[PDB]
Amino acid sequence: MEKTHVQLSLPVLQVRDVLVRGFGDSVEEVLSEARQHLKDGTCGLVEVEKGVLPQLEQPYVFIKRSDARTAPHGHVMVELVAELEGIQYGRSGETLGVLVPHVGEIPVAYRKVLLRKN
Ligand SMILES: C[C@@H](N)c1ccc(Br)cc1
Numbered sequence: 738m739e740k741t742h743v744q745l746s747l748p749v750l751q752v753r754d755v756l757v758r759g760f761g762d763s764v765e766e767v768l769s770e771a772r773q774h775l776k777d778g779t780c781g782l783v784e785v786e787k788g789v790l791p792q793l794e795q796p797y798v799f800i801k802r803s804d805a806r807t808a809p810h811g812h813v814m815v816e817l818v819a820e821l822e823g824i825q826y827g828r829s830g831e832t833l834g835v836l837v838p839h840v841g842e843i844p845v846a847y848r849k850v851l852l853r854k855n
Pocket of ligand 1: 757
């Protein structure tokens with residue numbers, strides 16, 4: 738059975754290397770596909786800086802900090818929040834980055850997270 742939270746180490750990708758720049762065409766689809774790729778180990782993370790989001794496809798899936806009181810074992814506790822046309826679906830803390838499919842790109846780092854399964 739799946740636990741409420743899972744430890745994952747996500748590959749951090751540079752935006753210009755990403756081949757598949759989003760998970761789908763609707764808020765519900767991108768959240769669904771992101772969660773599936775997270776379970777399969779085929780999800781990467783792009784850190785948000787100026788210029789990044791316009792190079793990626795909407796809707797966006799962000800991982801955001803869900804608890805600022807403790808980060809177990811160095812894994813920041815995080816949850817998913819989607820965004821389309823300036824409207825967010827969920828409310829959470831600070832953005833760690835935007836999730837994208839990982840299809841073999843070489844990462845620049847790994848980001849340890851404790852992901853809320855839902
Ligand atoms: C199964 C593999 N060909 C693949 C499917 C969808 C996405 Br998104 C990335 C890779």
